[PDB]
Structures are given as structure tokens and as C-alpha cells.
Amino acid sequence: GIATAIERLLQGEEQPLGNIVSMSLQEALKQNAAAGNIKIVAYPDTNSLLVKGTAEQVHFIEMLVKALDVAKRHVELS
Amino acid sequence: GIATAIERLLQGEEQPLGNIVSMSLQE
Amino acid sequence: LEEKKQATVVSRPVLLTQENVPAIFDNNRTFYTKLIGERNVALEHVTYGTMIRVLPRFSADGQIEMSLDIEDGNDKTPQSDTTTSVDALPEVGRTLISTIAR
Amino acid sequence: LWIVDLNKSDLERLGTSWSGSITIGDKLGVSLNQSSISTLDGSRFIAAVNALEEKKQATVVSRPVLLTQENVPAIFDNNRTFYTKLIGERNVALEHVTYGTMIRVLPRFSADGQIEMSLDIEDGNDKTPQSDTTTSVDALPEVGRTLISTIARVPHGKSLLVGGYTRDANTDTVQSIPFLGKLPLIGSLFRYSSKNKSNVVRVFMIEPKEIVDPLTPDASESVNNILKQSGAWSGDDKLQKWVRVYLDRG
Amino acid sequence: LWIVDLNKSDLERLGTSWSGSITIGDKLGVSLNQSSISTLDGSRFIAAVNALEEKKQATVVSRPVLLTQENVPAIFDNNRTFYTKLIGERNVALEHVTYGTMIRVLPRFSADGQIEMSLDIEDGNDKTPQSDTTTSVDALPEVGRTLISTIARVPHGKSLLVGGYTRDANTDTVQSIPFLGKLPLIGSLFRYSSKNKSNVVRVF
Amino acid sequence: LWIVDLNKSDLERLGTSWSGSITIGDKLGVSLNQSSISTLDGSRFIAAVNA
Amino acid sequence: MIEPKEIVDPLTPDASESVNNILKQSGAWSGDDKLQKWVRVYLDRG
Amino acid sequence: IRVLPRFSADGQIEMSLDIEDGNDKTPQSDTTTSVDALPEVGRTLISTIAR
Amino acid sequence: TPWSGYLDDVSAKFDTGVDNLQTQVTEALDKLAAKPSDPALLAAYQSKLSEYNLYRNAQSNTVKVFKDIDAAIIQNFR
Amino acid sequence: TPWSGYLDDVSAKFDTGVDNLQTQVTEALDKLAAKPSDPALLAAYQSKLSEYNLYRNAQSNTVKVFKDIDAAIIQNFR
Amino acid sequence: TPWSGYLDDVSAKFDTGVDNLQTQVTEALDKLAAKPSDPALLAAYQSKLSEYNLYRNAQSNTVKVFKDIDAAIIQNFR
Amino acid sequence: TPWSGYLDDVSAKFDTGVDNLQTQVTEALDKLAAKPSDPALLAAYQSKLSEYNLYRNAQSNTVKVFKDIDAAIIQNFR
Amino acid sequence: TPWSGYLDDVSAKFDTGVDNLQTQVTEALDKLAAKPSDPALLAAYQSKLSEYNLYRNAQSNTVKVFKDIDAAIIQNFR
Amino acid sequence: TPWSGYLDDVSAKFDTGVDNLQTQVTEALDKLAAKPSDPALLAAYQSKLSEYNLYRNAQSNTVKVFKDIDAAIIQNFR
Amino acid sequence: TPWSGYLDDVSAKFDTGVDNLQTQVTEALDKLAAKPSDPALLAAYQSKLSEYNLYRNAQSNTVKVFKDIDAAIIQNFR
Amino acid sequence: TPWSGYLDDVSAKFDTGVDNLQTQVTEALDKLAAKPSDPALLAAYQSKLSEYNLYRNAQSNTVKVFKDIDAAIIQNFR
Amino acid sequence: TPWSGYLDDVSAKFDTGVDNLQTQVTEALDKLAAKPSDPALLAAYQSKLSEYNLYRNAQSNTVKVFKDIDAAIIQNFR
Amino acid sequence: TPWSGYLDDVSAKFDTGVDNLQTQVTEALDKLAAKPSDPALLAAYQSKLSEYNLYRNAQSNTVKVFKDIDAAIIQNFR
């Protein structure tokens, strides 16, 4: 699932992250977040994700998961 | 349950926490 | 000798559950039929097994998605020796489905 | 929890079937429908006529009740053995079936007043090849084994279904002689019809209620209404008097 | 603790069932209801009529008493073997059933006067295929095996139900010959009726 | 310690039950209560009384 | 075939009302006997 | 039949098939018209991807 | 469903293989005990009892061998 | 819950695989002990006794295998 | 108190399964030796002796199998 | 596809080594059970069952030797 | 409060991982000793006795593993 | 007071589990040796010998198992 | 995400090396528990059980060998 | 096609050693039922039935011995 | 060159130790099956079958003992 | 080029020391699976199967010895 895919995706890699394609000193220290510091756990009984992070990466990975589960289509064999 | 989900979420990680989205030096 | 045969059976299991939790059901009745004879006496009978295991979830737009696995049928029994006895109780093949559907 | 069963059926059997052989002059042997000439040479043709119809309808309604506290488990199971009178006292035998029922629960409360329970139940009789005669299977009905595992919440004092089962079934057949079974004179002498129709419903409903107060009147008052009406109260005897009053009122 | 059972039942059986065979001139053989002519050539058709009705009712009431201190366990179990008189002293035989019952408890006190206990109880006989004669199963009643596992608190001196079991059941059937079971003169001569009704309550 | 038991009982059994068979002309066979005609043709119906 | 449906409300009328229409019409109701009457109402209505 | 399908860009559907069909080989139905009464078919196995 | 093992089913093939052989012995016995001087009844009972003797002998020798086959394989498991 | 291991679960499938085999041996013995000279009762009880022997033989040797499988694995822990 | 095992309980069931089979053999022997020419007493004694002969043969072989059931499991302890 | 190892393949060679022997025993028993007094049917079923009896005994002992062959080599790994 | 180290907690995980095996072995021995000839009681007891053997073997070897891991680290203190 | 280890207590439960089985084997032998031709005494002593056979075999193999459980644990002390 | 070392990957090669042996052992037990007296089912089950016995023994012994190889090299670091 | 073992080849040697002995018995039954009072037909029937009786007895003991000869070798595999 | 081990050489010595036992059994069976009522052929075939029966038992047991000699020494290599 | 050490060559001498044992076991099994009741084929197969059991056991134990010779000295290098 998700809570294994993007966990091991950000394995290691003390690095910040950029932009998804399908004030300076304060903003740089929050832009000095580790990619490996993301910790994600699943929770089945409400079909939900528990994510955690700094003030932009919680907003950031919201943009990933909104373009990751699409409604699947039915196909009938004969 | 509850007492395992947010338990293992915060393993380690000596850090403060910010704000939930769905005296000064002492403070 | 000539004969024509036609048989019908319609069955429904119903159950309810909550979202995101599993639910199991299975059933097997044993159905008999009247073999002709009280002193020269014998009987024959078949079961009808049915099993359903589910795990549902909700959507955003209102659709309901379910994860199905079902089994149904009788056991392979060499029995019912007389002619109308197999006519007396119909048979259905063993089956298995495994499919998610919204 | 309420166990309620409804059963309904009917069955008919009508018609005959013919076979045998005749011989002519030791020159020809004609055999209709698998009559082997190796066992019979002069034995003429026989028949076998069936005529029988019956209707069956059955009902069973049972409820186990029990209480427990919040957040603790509770187990219940039961199995009685039911007999019935086979006709005969010297040529004597008996037959019997058991009836197991089990309920295991683990409840909790809610905020709005609903009660949520965690159910798993099994019910039915054991598979006994017995009850050889005709009305004996009519004497004791059978029910399938079952298993549920489901959480459900329900508001206080009202009722909720937990699961059920219906079934309807037909059978129609006509067996006949090809040439001779269609002439309008005696064409009904060569038919063989046997229809069959059955339908059955089985459902479990449930309803809880909270209980706080003790029971009015006392149980000892209740059983004294039992024995004085069943004709078995034994407090009158002045030899059993001593021990019973020594235990009863303290 | 109070064990109380009420039993009441009745059963009737009335009607006949026909079978047999006739032969004609050693040229034709008519056989009613599976009478094979390979075993019989001259035995004419027979009947078999049943007429019998009975009512059955049974009651059993039992109480175990014991005392204990607070917070300590206490065990009790019992099994008597009950006999009944099968008719015969020279042509002699017996049949018998055991009756196991077990109760294990652990009480404690409260502040208001209630007593909280942790119960597990069993009672009944073992499933024994025995008691071969007719009135012998009438001679000794049966009770189901049971199991409770429940904690309960109860105010002092009063009583509380702990769990019970009721059952109601019907059965109706009529077996008859289709054409001749409809004539208005003696059409009830070809029936086979057997109603059945039983009901049983059991509570601790 | 005192072990003390008291026992008291009574039991009755009264009445009869009838069965058997008659035959008519080797043309009809009437059987009361499961008396098979394949073992008996002329033994008339009996009773059994208990008191 | 399959079909789900959402269920929100409890069941109208009561089951005990339903089965009492069942038992009094199937012919097995046993509240009439004045010896089993006591224990049955002692458990039923509280 | 056991399958695992997928879509394409142009509208084709690609599925991964494995299918079996037939009866088990039972030498039985000894009389002449009985084997004529019910025909037999050989066992088979396919294993193929196809769009 | 009433359970039947393979040795139950082997003994069941004799049970389903004969229609009413348990009935045929009892009916032939009642005519012999009624009149034990009929040559037609003695020769009929001699044939069926010897058939019933080989009936019980052929079932029982087959079940004993499959018991020993089954006991020989399970010992060779471990 | 009274705990039951994996070795319990292999032996429990044999217990659940037969429906009422413990009853069927006892019921066939009760009809046999009343009159132990009936060939229909001896042959019915012979099938069920030989079936019950192979039941216990298959149960006891199979659990013995999984005990010996695990002890070789538990030995390779340290 | 005389102790009784499971094999004692199986062997007691053959003894309790028959009412007075130990009595009926002894009573039939004393009447034959008083007058060993009565056809009613010889035919009655052949039937009762053959039931008791098959009685002892069926008991001793059944205890032998259940001994072997127990001996196969106890051997699989170690 | 059900996977099959070498011990499956040795036992499969016995299964493929006989053409329809599992059927022929079944065919000889059903023909024997219809009329269990025919010497032509008696001689066919004793021959085919005893052939099938030696079939299973040779099958079960061959797999048993290679188990001890494989287990002696794997023990000599460490 | 009984003090418990981490090595205690590993051994406690076997103790808390099973609910009542120490009770079930003692209860199964007492029912067996009442009637030590019942095959239904022996097969239940073979499973529970073999279960207690694998319980302690898996328990004692795991604590042994963490001791040598700790002993390898503590020597590298000085 | 007899000192008793754990291996003593398992073996003591068989001795106390039977009331007077040691007497019943000796007493049935003493009654048998006076007249070793009574089928009531032969069948009772065959039964009692089989109870004594399963009694000693179940005691001695079970104590052997608990010795082997303990000896594997004590080795992992040092 | 399950982390996988080389020792995880070697044990995974045994897991991926058999196709559906985990299914075939479980399905053959389910077919065995329905009727544990069929020689066609017994001979099929003997092969699959012996295949599963060598499966875990070859898997666990190889990792045990490879465990001891790494620790001798790591000891020669300091 | 009917598969043939070594005992099939042994039993076929009995079948080819006599030309039409299975055929010749059928003619003597057909001649007796037409006229069961001819001494020439009676003397013909005594010879062929006793020859067919020794035919089945000599075949059945030979297949029974070679089963135990083969089983003695197959038991000596492991 | 057909290879021959030491166990092959003991078993090959049985084939050469008898001159034409494979011939004499086959020739005596072929003469008996042509006319299975001659006592000179019955007495000749009883002798030849019994020598070949004792032949294979002595053949099969001799290779097994030296095998058991070999299996005891090879474990004592390492 | 497949490299071969000294330890490969010692086990290879057993493979080259026997001529066609992988072929000879398989051909005797194929002749056995075609007709699994011939004592001439069983005794030939008994000789070849028992030699192959001692073949792999003698092969595998020698390599185990040479493994243990090198491992005691190589630890004593440093």
C-alpha cells in the first residue's frame, strides 16, 4: 500500500524536497527538513493516514496523495 | 488501536509540536 | 422412454456490518426427500453449503465498495441410487469467486 | 436474541412404469426397458404405479437471554437432547437429535445512548444418520449449522436485525411413453408426474435493554408459587422440616 | 442459586399408509408403492394404521447453597446417578444417567452493600444414547449442558436473573393418497395426520 | 463435621397399550402400531397392562 | 447477483410484536398456562 | 479461470490468463448408450497474456 | 452432513450395491421357521445365507488391508 | 481466551474434520452390546472402529512431525 | 474403592450391555446335563453358547486395538 | 500451477506408471458388489486390489528413503 | 513492584504471549491421570505436552541470544 | 515426608491417580492362578493386564520428556 | 516496509523458490481432514509433508551457516 | 485400455492355459436347466464344477502368496 | 560395463547361486495352467514356489543387514 | 570455465567412481512403475536403491570431515 510505498521511498536521504510534477533565514531552516524524518502509519478502522512533519511537508504530501488514488474502473470478462 | 498508532508514530524524535490541521523565554 | 426436466432454486443470504470491519457467514442445511416406502425403507439427502466473507468501505461520492469471496455448492456424494431421487433434490456445482467491486 | 424458523413444503408423486417380456414359439424374445431375458422366460410383464401426496409446514421460535457488564466478555452455550416416540413397545428402539446454541458477546456503551456489541454465534443440530421411518424426519426438524462474526450498534430499547436466510425451490418433471402417452383415450395410463415445491425462511433478530434494579417479587416467592401449583412442595413434612428452615430464612 | 425448569409437550399420530400388489392372470402385475413382484406373487395389498396420542410434562427445581469470605475462591460440584424402574425382576435390566453440576465463584464487597461475584457455572447430563424402552426416556427428564461466564453485582438480600432459555416449536403434516383422499364419503380413511407441539423454558 | 442426607420418593405406572394385526381373506392386511405382516398373519392383537 | 444498502434506523415494529403475531397465529403461544405464566412474565417485561 | 487485467492508452485491454477445462479421466459408464448420453472433453491448460 | 471416511465408503459400496439384502434374509427366515420341511424354502435359504456369508467376508477383509496400508504410510511420515 | 498454538490447530482440524465420530462409535457399540451376534451390527462397528484407529494414528504422528520440525528450527536460533 | 479405567469402562459396557448373559449360560448347561436328549434344550443351548462365544471373541479383539491406539501415541511422546 | 518438488515427482512416477489402476480397483469393486459370488469377479478383484495394495506400499517406502537421504546431507551443512 | 530489565521483558513476552499454558498442562495431566486409557484424552494431551516443550525451548534460547550480544558490546567499553 | 522434585510429582500423579490398580492386577492374578480356565477371569485379567500395560508405559515415557526439557535449559546457563 | 538484508533475501529465495507449496500443504490437510482414509489422498499428503519438512530444514540451516560466516569476519575488525 | 501388472500377467497365464473352460461351464448349466434328470448331463456337470472350484482356489492362493512375497521386499526398503 | 557394488555382489550371488529358479518357476506354472488338476504338477509347483519364496526372503534380508552395518560406521566418520 | 576446488573433486570421485548410478536407479524405477509386482524386478531394484542410499551417505560424510579439518586450522591462523 501507500504506508509502505512512500515510507521506503524517502529512505535515508537527509535532504529537502522541491516540487511535484505529474524572511529568508527563517524560511531556510524550515526548508532544512530531512526527507527521512517523515513517519507515516496506517489506521484501518477509519480508512485514513496518519502523517507528521513540519508546516509545509504536511501540506506537500497532501498534493501527492490527491493524485495517487484514482477511482478504478470495472471490466467484465466473457 | 489508538494506544499503538500514535505511540509508534512518535518513536524517538525529541522535538516540540506545532498546530493540528485536519514570560517569553520561559514560555 | 421420454421425459423433460426443469428445476428452479432461488436463495438469498442477508447480513449487515459496519464500515472497514470484516464479517463472516456460512450455512449448510441438509435437505431430505421422501423415498417411497415405510417398511422397505431407506432415505437419501443432500447438503447446500454457502459461505460469504466480506470487508466493505465507503467512498467520497456515495458509492459502496465491497471485497467478496464466496463459496457455494454440495459435496460430491455418490448416493441417491433410484431415478427420481436425483430429480427429487437438485444439484449445483461447487463454486468460488474472488472479486472487489464498487 | 431471537431465533425463529419457518419451513413450508409440499410434494406429489403420480404415475406408473411398465416392464417385462413375452416369448413366442422359442423364436423371438421381446424385452421392454431392461428386462433381462437371462432371469425370466415366461414371466409376463408387470407394472409399478405410484400415488402419494403430502404437505409439510414447520415453525420453531427460541430465545436465549443473558446479561453481562460493560467491557467484559460473556459466554453462553447449551445443548438439549430431544427424543420422540417411535411406534412400538416390544419391537423397541429410539431416536434422538441434539440442539446446540451458543452466544458470545463483549459489549460497550456509547455517547448517544446506543449499545455496541460484538457477536459470534453458532446454531443447529448435529448430523445424525438415523430416523429411518417416514414421519420420524417429520417428527424432528433440522436446521443448518451457522456462524456469524459482526459488530453492530443499536439504540437503547429498540431492535435490530443481525442476519438471515430465505430459500425457495421448485421441481417439475413429466415421464412418459413416447408413442402411447399422447393419445386422448388412455394416455393418462402411461404418464408419470412428480412436482415439488419448497420454501423456507430463517432469521435472527436482536434487542438489548439496560437493567439497573433488582427483581420484584423475590425468587423464593416465585418458586413457592411453583411448588404449590405443581403439587410438589415439601415443607409440610415434619422430618424434612428441620433442615429446610435451617437453610431458608438464615 | 436457583435452577428451575418447566417442560410441557404433546404429540398425536393418526392415519394409515397403504402398499402391496395384485397380479392378473400371470399376464399383468399391479404393484402399489414399490412392492417388487420379484419377491411376491400372491401377497395382496396391506395397510398400516397408527392411532396414538400423548401429553408429556416435566418439572425440576434445584438450589445449591454455600457461604464464603470476601475475595477468596470457592468450588462446588456434584453428580448424582439417577435410576428408574424398568419393568421386570426376572426379565431384568436397568438404565441410569448422571447429572453433573459445577459452580465456581469469587465474591467481594462494595461500599453501598452490594456484592460483586465472578461466576462460571455448568449443569446437566451427558449425551447418552441409552434408555431403550419407551417410558424410560419419560422416566428420566433431560436438561441441557450449560456454561455461563459473567461478573455481576447485586444488592444485599435480593435476587437477580443470570440467564435463561425458552423455546417454542410447532409441526404439522398430513400424508394421503391424491385422488381417493378427496371423496366426500370416506376420504379421511386414506390420511395420515400427525400434529406436534412442544414448549420449554429454562432459567437460572 | 456433620454429613446428613434425607431421601424420599414415589412412582406410579398404570395403563395399557395395544398392538397387533388381523388379516382378511389374504386380500387385505390391517396392522395396528407397526406390526409387520411379513412375520405374522394370524396372531391376533394383544395388550399389555401395567399397574 | 449482489446489492448493498445503507441502514440507519432501528426496526419498526418491534420483533417481540412481530413474533407475537407469529406465535398466536402459528398456534404455539404458552402464556395461557397458569403455571408457566409466572416465570415467563418475570423474565419478559423486566 | 484466474486473471489479472489492465488497461491501455488507446482503449485496448490486456489480461493475463490461465484457464483449465474438462472432466477427470474416469473409465466408467460401461453400457453402450450411456457414454453416448453424456459426452466427454479432454483436459486443457492455457497460460497466455493477451491484449 | 453425516461424515463417512473412505473405509466407511468402501463398506457403503456394499450397502448401496445391494438394494434390500438385509430385508431378503429376514423374509426368507420367517417362512422357514413357520414350516421347516419345505424343499423350496431350504434351497432358497441355503443360497442367500452363503451369499450373505461371502458378503460379510468380502467387506471385512478389504477394510483390514486398507487399515494396514493407512497405518504403514503414517508411520513413514516422520 | 484459553490459548491454543499451531500444534493445537493442526490437531484441531482432525477434530473438526469429523462431525460426530465420537458419538457414532458409541452409538454403534450400544446397539452391538445389547445383542453381540448380529452380522449387521458387527460389520457396522468394524468399519467405524477401523476408521477411529486410523483417526488417532493420523492425529498423533502428524503432531509429532511438527514438533520435530520446530525443535530443529529453535535449535538454530542461538 | 476399586479403581476403574477407560479400558475398564469399555469392558464394563460389554458386561452391562448384556443383562444376564453370565447367568443364562450357566442355567442352560444344568438343564442339558439332566436330560441330554431333549430337542428343545439342545437348540436353545446352541444359540446361547454361540452368542457367548462371539461375545468373548468380540471383547478381546476390541481391547487389543485400543491398547495399540494408546501404545502408538505414548511411543510418540519422546 | 501447483508446484512439485523431486519427492513429489518420484511419487508422481508411480502415479503415471500405472495407467488407470485407481479406476480399475473401483471398477472391480462395483462389479463385485453387485453379485459377490462370481468366481470371475472374485479372481479379478483379488488380483487388482492386491496389485493396488503393493502399489501404495512401494510408493510410501520409496519416498521414505529419500527423506532420510536428504536429511543426512543437510545436517552436514553446518 | 518486581523489577524487570529488558532481558526480563523478552522472557516476559513469552510469559504474556501465552494466556494459560501453565494451567492447561496441569489441568490436562490431572484429567489424564484420572483415566489414562482414553484416546480422546491422550491426543489432547500429546498436543498440550508438546506445546509446553516448544514454549520453553523458544523462551530459553532467545534470552541466551541477547546475552552474548550484550556481552560483545560491554567488552568494548574499556 | 517424602521429598519430591518436579519429576517426582509427575510420576506421583499416576500412582495417586489410580486407587488400587496395583492391587487389582495382583488380585486378579491370584484368583486366576487357582483356576486358569474361567472366561470371566480370563477376560478380566486380559483387560487388567492391558490397563497395567498402558499404565507403566504412559508414566515412564512422560517423565523422560520432562527430563529432556529441563536438560536443554540448564545448558544455556553459562 | 519490511527491511531486507541479504539474510532476508536468502530466506526469501526459499519462499519465492516454491510457487504455492504453502497453499498445497494447507489444501492437502483440508482434503485430508475431510476424509483421512483415502490412499490416493494419503500418498499425495505424504509427499507434500515430506517436501515441507525439507523446505524448512534447508532454509533454516543455510541461514545458520551464513550467520556464523559474518561474525568471524566482523570479529577481525578491531 | 486395461492396464496390466505382474499378477495380471500371472492371472492371464491361467486364462490362456485353458482354452474355453469359462465357456464350457456355461454350456453345462444350459443343458441342465432344460432337462434336469439326465445322468449323462449330471456326470458331465460334476466334472466341470469341481474343475472350476480347484481353478479359483489355486489362483487365489497364488496371488495371495506373491502379495506377501512382494510386501516382504517392499517392507525391506527402509 | 554394468557397475556392481558390494551389496550388488551379494545379491547377484543369489541369482547365480540358483541355476534356473527363474526358469523352473515359470516352466512349472506354464505346465500347471494348461491342466490344473494333475497332482504331479501340483506337487511339482508347490515345491518350486516354496523354494523361490524362501529364495527372495533370504535375498532381501542379506542386503539389509550389511546395509545396517554400513549405516552404523558412516555416522562414526566425523 | 566451471572452477573446481579440492573439496569439489573429493565428492566428484564418488560420482566418477560409480558409472551410471543416476541412470540405473531411474531405469529400474521406470521398469518398476510399469509393473510393480515382479520379485525379479523388486530384488534388482532393492539392490540398486540400497546402494544409492549408502552412496550419498558415504559421499556427504567425507566432505563434512574435510570441512571440519580446514575449519579447525583456519581459526588458528591469526
From Swiss-Prot, chain B:
* UniProt subcellular location: Cell outer membrane
Coiled coil located at which positions? Answer: none
- Record note on disruption phenotype: Insertion mutants are hypoinvasive in the HEp-2 cell assay.
Highest rank taxon of the organism: Bacteria
Please describe what this protein does: Component of the type III secretion system (T3SS), also called injectisome, which is used to inject bacterial effector proteins into eukaryotic host cells. Forms a ring-shaped multimeric structure with an apparent central pore in the outer membrane.
Family designation: Belongs to the bacterial secretin family. T3SS SctC subfamily.
Quaternary structure, from the entry: The core secretion machinery of the T3SS is composed of approximately 20 different proteins, including cytoplasmic components, a base, an export apparatus and a needle. This subunit is part of the base, which anchors the injectisome in the bacterial cell envelope. Forms a stable homooligomeric complex. The complex is composed of 15 subunits.
Q: What is this protein called?
A: SPI-1 type 3 secretion system secretin
Which species does the entry assign this protein to? Salmonella typhimurium (strain LT2 / SGSC1412 / ATCC 700720)
Q: What is the lineage of its organism?
A: Bacteria, Pseudomonadati, Pseudomonadota, Gammaproteobacteria, Enterobacterales
Q: Which gene encodes it?
A: sctC1
Instruction: Please tell me where this chain falls within the complete protein, as first and last residue plus total length.
Output: 206 to 256 of 562
Curated annotation (Swiss-Prot), chains I, J, K, L, M, N, O, P, Q, R:
Alphabetical keyword list? Protein transport, Secreted, Transport, Virulence
**Phenotype upon knockout?**
The null mutant strain is non-invasive.
Q: Which SUPFAM superfamilies does the entry mention?
A: MxiH-like (SSF140129)
Query: From the record, what ranges are coiled-coil?
Result: none
Q: Which GO terms describe its molecular function?
A: identical protein binding
- Answer whether the UniProt record assigns the keyword Transport to this protein: yes
What would changing D9A do, according to UniProt?
Exhibits constitutive secretion of substrates. Retains the ability to display SipD/SctA at the tip of the needle filament
Give, from the UniProt record, the effect of changing E51A.
Exhibits constitutive secretion of substrates. Retains the ability to display SipD/SctA at the tip of the needle filament. Does not yield assembled filaments in vitro
Q: Does the keyword Secreted apply?
A: yes
Q: Do you know which Pfam families this protein is assigned to?
A: T3SS_needle_F
What happens after mutating Q24A? Non-invasive phenotype
Activity control mechanisms:
Binding of bile salts, including deoxycholate, to the PrgI:SipD interface may inhibit the T3SS function.
Which region is the signal sequence? Answer: none
- One GO BP: protein secretion by the type III secretion system
What does the UniProt entry list as the effect of changing F77A? Abrogates host cell invasion and effector secretion
What mutagenesis or variant effect is reported for N76A?
A: Exhibits constitutive secretion of substrates. Retains the ability to display SipD/SctA at the tip of the needle filament
Question: What happens after mutating Q75M?
Answer: Cannot secrete the translocases SipB/SctE and SipC/SctB. Retains the ability to assemble needle complexes, but is not able to invade cultured epithelial cells
Explain what the record says happens when changing T1A: Can only secrete early substrates such as InvJ/ScpT, PrgJ/SctI and PrgI/SctF. Can polymerize into filaments in vitro and in vivo, but the stability of the filaments is compromised
Q: How does it assemble?
A: The core secretion machinery of the T3SS is composed of approximately 20 different proteins, including cytoplasmic components, a base, an export apparatus and a needle. This subunit polymerizes and forms the helical needle filament. Interacts with the needle tip protein SipD/SctA. Interacts with the needle adapter protein PrgJ/SctI, the secretin InvG/SctC and the minor export apparatus protein SpaP/SctR. In vitro, the needle protomer refolds spontaneously to extend the needle from the distal end.
Q: Which family does it belong to?
A: Belongs to the SctF family.
Q: What is known of its domains?
A: Deletion of the last five residues prevents self-association and yields monomeric proteins that allow biophysical studies. Forms a right-handed helical assembly with roughly 11 subunits per two turns. The location of the negatively charged surfaces are radically different among the needle filament proteins PrgI, BsaL and MxiH. In PrgI, the major negatively charged surface is not on the 'face' but instead is on the 'side' of the two-helix bundle, and only residues from helix alpha1 contribute to this negative region.
Q: What name goes with this protein?
A: SPI-1 type 3 secretion system needle filament protein
What species is given as this protein's source? Salmonella typhimurium (strain LT2 / SGSC1412 / ATCC 700720)
Record lineage? Bacteria, Pseudomonadati, Pseudomonadota, Gammaproteobacteria, Enterobacterales
